[PDB]
Amino acid sequence: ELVSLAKLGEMRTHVGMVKRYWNPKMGFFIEPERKHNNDHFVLELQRQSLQTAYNYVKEVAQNNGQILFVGTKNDYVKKLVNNIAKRVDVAFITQRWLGGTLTNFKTLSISINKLNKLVEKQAENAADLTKKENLMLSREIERLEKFFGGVKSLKRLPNLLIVDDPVYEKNAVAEANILRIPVVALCNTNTNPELVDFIIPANNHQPQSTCLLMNLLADAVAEAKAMPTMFAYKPDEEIQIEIPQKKQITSQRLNITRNPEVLTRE
Amino acid sequence: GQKVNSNGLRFGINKNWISRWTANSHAQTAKWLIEDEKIRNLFFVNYRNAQVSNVEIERTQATVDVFVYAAQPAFLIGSENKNIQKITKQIKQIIGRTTNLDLTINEIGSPMLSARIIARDLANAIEARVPLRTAMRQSLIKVLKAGANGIKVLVSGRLNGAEIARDKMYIEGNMPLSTLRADIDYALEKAQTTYGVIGVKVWINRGMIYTKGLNRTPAHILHPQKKQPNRQ
Amino acid sequence: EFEERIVKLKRISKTTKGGRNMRFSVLVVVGNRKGKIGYGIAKALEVPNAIKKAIKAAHNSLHTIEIHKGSIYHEVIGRSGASRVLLKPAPQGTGIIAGGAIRAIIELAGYSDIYTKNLGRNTPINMIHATMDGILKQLSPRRVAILRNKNLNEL
């Protein structure tokens, strides 16, 4: 099968956030509460939702759809998306999601066409560039690459979106919903279930759980486009992973003291 | 506020002079300066249907040379060179029989991107009671389709016969007016309407002049052949 | 053949540091007279560009309309803000008993015989919103049969 239930339990993909931060509409994916303070999930629901999303993304990638991976979150998520893009040639937006990346696609298409033209001009090279103008062109290349390096490949609106956190990507999921594009996400007890189509009840704070699930989706894509897989349909000795640096791991949401009353009074 | 003349700011740097002569004394400098004005005004106010873009005048101690660039020189030519003699006699009366005239008609290539004839067409359409929005839109679209850079058209006056004067501007494309390197051709014309006078000013951008020099080169007369005669 | 007609052409304006910026706003209703109709409101410095943008918005936002015997199935009240529009089914022959924005919406949608009355405000955009809400809230007599496990509108 896809994964092992004890493996999910060990990667802690069945722990959400503190009970304080939760959307009541996500009560379906949480079993009746208990002395746990971090909103444990239902493992069968996790596996079922993951299998459904896997099947859909596999179908899209086999039928040659264009999927876009979006993480503009912690540096680990950024590097994870970059590695997944290296593994499979899917489009990605690791930097900030630009306003209207999908609903205003014409202007960003103009920008990426300009980026491609500048890139080929620089590659063709010329002695007229000298030093100053060459440096300015290189800096422009660097900026449009940092902000459009994953979008340059596509020429048309993508057929599917994969979001690491719908709460953080509220703009991206809103654009996907207004354009009627499928969007899958790793909901983490604080997300509105209506916006996401293929909900995957999961963790979003654990750098091991997010890595495992993101690599599972990438494994679906890579199997559909036919390379050897990475995590899916694999034993423990190859599924095992490490915990990034910098007793047990602490998925506790803290720092409530930085939420003061809005400036008021007269 | 007020802006300096686009032609006047660029004259003597990236634009040659329309009249090139050196007079003998101050008395002759005024006569020669007025005769050329009369000739140019003649060619512009009458024989207007030929779309005469510009006329340049070149004089020596005693010889007058006229270069008339026109879009449809067939009207100047006439039927088997008829009106040619009429305009030759008009010029000879203007300057004098004692001098030698060397009139030369030149077909201007790619006429559409010339502010003089664009403004003349604008004024003709205004005088012909053509609606202004349609007139400016069609002129702008044809100018752009001609394959040039931005064009800015300003039409001011008693607009559509109204009792309160307005002004309407259409810029379409980059028109750097502060830049001196740009090749900006500016023309201004008066549409004599039944309700008064309408002023049409057309700026047209025709690229950047990257070759240093006081022109000494044709300006958008070269894309097709520019060879018409009537000279000696 | 998506016919279009102009419902309102207002002259809106803002104030700047000396003078007033005046823009025309158009409310266009686009309908194919077969079941597709949308509305679009746009603002521009000139009427042609305003109309172009309004038509673009109306074609971007199109809604599906179902007709029964050329009319509306059941009496409905569309609410939008302070405008309430009452629609009532009519027998074949009475024609359009609508006037103004409701009439434009109904004709461009394709209905033949409708009884209408504007019970509230008379602002065209809100009247159009109320009319669209009333027509959209409508229930076909097959969805209710599916819901209640009846037999395709049989007794």
Next chain:
RNA sequence: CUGCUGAUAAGGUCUUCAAAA
């Protein structure tokens, strides 16, 4: 770091229009 500090005749333009290219 709190002195003082009052008033401004009447009526008025200015959007013609999108039918459309």
Next chain:
RNA sequence: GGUGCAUGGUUGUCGUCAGCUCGUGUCGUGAGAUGUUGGGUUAAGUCCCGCAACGAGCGCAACCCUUAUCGUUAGUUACA
């Protein structure tokens, strides 16, 4: 001769101050908002980061002239 309160053209002033807008997109029933605000740096809406905005035009700057050092070309009617 009248009407600059019927106009074209030209000009003063805010002010050589740094502003004025537009296309597409999004938010709002609507006027409208966003971009143009926020943090740094400038004479500058000059530029860079941030950012439901992405870009663009006019303005700013540079390209134009002259003064400040030098090389080369030429040496009369300069110099000698």
Next chain:
RNA sequence: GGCGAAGGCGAAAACUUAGGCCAUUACUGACGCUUAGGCUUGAAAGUGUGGGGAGCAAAUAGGAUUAGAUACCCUAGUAGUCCACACCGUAAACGAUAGAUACUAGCUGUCGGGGCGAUCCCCUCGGUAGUGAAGUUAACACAUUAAGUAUCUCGCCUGG
């Protein structure tokens, strides 16, 4: 932050006395909600008679400022502010939101009773606050203490 129906209530004590919250294997057995008319209370100012008068201060006098100052500032200053007994019955008397009843996500505090027993913290029943989706609104905003879904009764509104 607590109490009362509202006005309102803050040095200590005694006496008399009103209502409320929680749990009830107890009792009466629809006896309840609203309330035209009626009655009771009702900040401060004001009235009448008798006391009291430290401070403050309408009216009043003077000095300043000012074009003028019958005002803002200052120095004095009567009624009044205080008590008892009788009236007056008005307030931005405001949550600008009548009372009663049933239902409709959640999160964060705080106060009281009850369950456990160091505090702290957990649960239940209520009071009082903030944030907040559905829902409502012209918008601001309200949002289980509703301005939401509905019922009952009373009062009130119909351009300036």
Next chain:
RNA sequence: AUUGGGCGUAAAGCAAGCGCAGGCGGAUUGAAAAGUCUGGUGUUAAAGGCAGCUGCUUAACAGUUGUAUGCAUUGGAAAC
């Protein structure tokens, strides 16, 4: 505004309470049948209204047939 409106900021919740009369009111059983529903009968003058037809050259108009509403009595229904 019974059908068919509202009272936080636009006109409109009495300053608050104790409250007689009035309006409304928990659950189940039985009776009667004052409201409610239904059948028969009498009547609601003619003209007028609506539908059909005839006659005026067609119409307006005239004539002709049908056409309700309420009350009373009597016979049943018992959900509110």
